[PDB]
């Protein structure tokens, strides 16, 4: 059904492929050519998960796991039973993720709005492809990619990390974590600021953006503004994911020893490298 204000916006057009063939809705959902492709890649993918669970011998959601090929398979294809399914599924998952993004472009065009959302979404699609495609290829085996299972994908995180000692010492991991931590701070403030102004003390009128800017200046001496906090939120979370892909593309490719040891370049700078005392020497 339709929101009270919605009919005036459901006009023909904005499609990228197909013209007016799939230009329609199903309940609230816009379909479009990439609505259909999403559904196709998604349903093909889910069928293959369930097949993988048949061969594995379990129907328990906390036990289904679809592993990549072994390392000795390098970058070739493996049999379905032993890593082939992961290969086909990974193709499907990508099919569905890009069709999702392209379908959002179409929704944007119909609505006359900017393309910022699919653009932001592509960065998450980037990160996924780093872990399942770009990193395995540079290393030379699909087996370095993570498995598709709820708890087993976590065991991969923990094993991969500890191959390099305390992964905390990856400098790109550090920056990535800062951006994640800051984005949440920023989000909490942005949410609290709007609500605190729309929902003032009992009996008082709605505050204004003047009150929002006054509050930040009184608090920290600077207010970034209402347009700028939205730029800030977009930028922080996009950078967070960017440096995540970065900390992972370099790990095991250009750097493969323990990450704590990478920091000896600083300590071993020649002008202070032998001054006694302190922690190092």
């Amino acid at each position: 059904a339709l929101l009270s204000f919605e009919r005036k916006y459901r006009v023909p057009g904005g499609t990228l492929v197909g013209g007016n063939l799939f230009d329609f809705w199903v309940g609230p959902f816009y379909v479009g050519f990439f609505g259909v492709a999403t559904f196709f890649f998604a349903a093909l993918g889910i069928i293959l998960i369930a097949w993988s669970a048949v061969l594995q011998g379990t129907w328990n959601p906390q036990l289904i796991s679809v592993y990549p090929p072994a390392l000795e398979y390098g970058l070739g294809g493996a049999p379905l039973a032993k890593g082939g399914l992961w290969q086909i599924i990974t193709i499907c998952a990508t099919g569905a993720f890009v069709s999702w993004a392209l379908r959002e472009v179409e929704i944007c065009r119909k609505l006359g709005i900017g393309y910022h959302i699919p653009f932001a979404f592509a960065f998450a699609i980037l990160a996924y492809l780093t872990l399942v495609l770009f990193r395995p290829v540079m290393m030379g085996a699909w087996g370095y990619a993570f498995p598709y299972g709820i708890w087993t994908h976590l065991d991969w995180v923990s094993n991969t990390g500890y191959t390099y000692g305390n992964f905390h010492y990856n400098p790109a991991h550090m920056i990535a974590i800062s951006f994640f931590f800051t984005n949440a701070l920023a989000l909490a403030l942005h949410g609290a600021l709007v609500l605190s102004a729309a929902n003032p003390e009992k009996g008082k009128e709605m505050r204004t953006p003047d009150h929002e800017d006054t509050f930040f200046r009184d608090l920290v001496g600077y207010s970034i503004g209402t347009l700028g906090i939205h730029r800030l939120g977009l930028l922080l979370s996009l950078s967070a994911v960017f440096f995540s892909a970065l900390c992972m593309i370099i790990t095991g490719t250009i750097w493969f020893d323990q990450w704590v040891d990478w920091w000896q370049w600083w300590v071993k700078l020649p002008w202070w490298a032998n001054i006694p005392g302190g922690i190092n020497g």
């Binding site: 329609f24 809705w25 009150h211």
Partner: protein, 240 residues
């Protein structure tokens, strides 16, 4: 044990939270409607919330949501199919008629005020001490359409005083009237302002404002809706 208790209690809290959250986001646009505007039979799982009332500043009354929703304007669209789900073709000019990406909403026909009660947006000629402080000053540059033709010249910048940002270019057309262009829909260049959404012959069609020194919320929507509509509707006149 105590940790099982903690995690069980949390999911129960989390569920009522999602429910609370889900119903706060029903305060605009409900109840759902059929395509002919009658109320839908299936309104979804969650009920509507007990209404809240905002006290608007500066003596402008209240707003209570959810409350009765009327588009408060005519919609020039016909059905293209015998069943739900399909587009609604425009019966006239969608740019003139304000449907599709050219849509506007019937907001108050008053200007947004700042915290002191003054007009929020003012032509810079009326905004004491305001000036362009960085970037290229567009005033005096000529405005170009997507058809690479010159529709007008920029005669002023309309500025948000409390937020100190440019919000509209005031463009003078060839008959001597002006129009407002959304600042987010133009590209200031060294020798020109370029408007990708409109071809030159659509500038005269931009909605005009009542008073020369103020712009109301209705007027802002009609202008902005019109200029975004050209991205779809003007497209038979855009070079690359």
């Amino acid at each position: 044990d105590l940790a099982s208790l903690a995690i069980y209690s949390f999911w129960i809290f989390l569920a009522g939270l999602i429910y609370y959250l889900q119903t706060e986001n029903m305060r605009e646009g409900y109840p759902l409607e059929n395509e002919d505007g009658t109320p839908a039979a299936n309104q979804g799982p969650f009920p509507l919330p007990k209404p809240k009332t905002f006290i608007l500043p500066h003596g402008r009354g209240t707003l209570t949501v959810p409350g009765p929703e009327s588009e408060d304007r005519p919609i020039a669209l016909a059905r293209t199919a015998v069943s739900e789900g399909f587009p609604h073709a425009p019966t006239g000019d969608p740019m003139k008629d304000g449907v599709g990406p050219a849509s506007w909403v019937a907001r108050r026909d008053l200007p947004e005020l700042d915290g002191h009660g003054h007009n929020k947006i003012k032509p810079m000629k009326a905004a004491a001490g305001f000036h362009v402080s960085a970037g290229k000053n567009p005033i005096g540059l000529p405005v170009r359409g997507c058809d690479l033709e010159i529709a007008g010249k920029v005669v002023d910048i309309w500025v948000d005083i409390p937020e100190q940002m440019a919000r509209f270019l005031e463009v003078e057309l060839k008959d001597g009237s002006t129009r407002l262009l959304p600042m987010q829909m133009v590209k200031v260049q060294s020798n020109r302002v370029h408007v990708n959404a409109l071809s030159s012959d659509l500038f005269a069609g931009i909605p005009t404002i009542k008073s020369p020194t103020e712009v109301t919320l209705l007027e802002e929507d009609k202008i902005c809706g019109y200029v975004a509509g050209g991205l779809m509707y003007a497209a038979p006149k855009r070079k690359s």
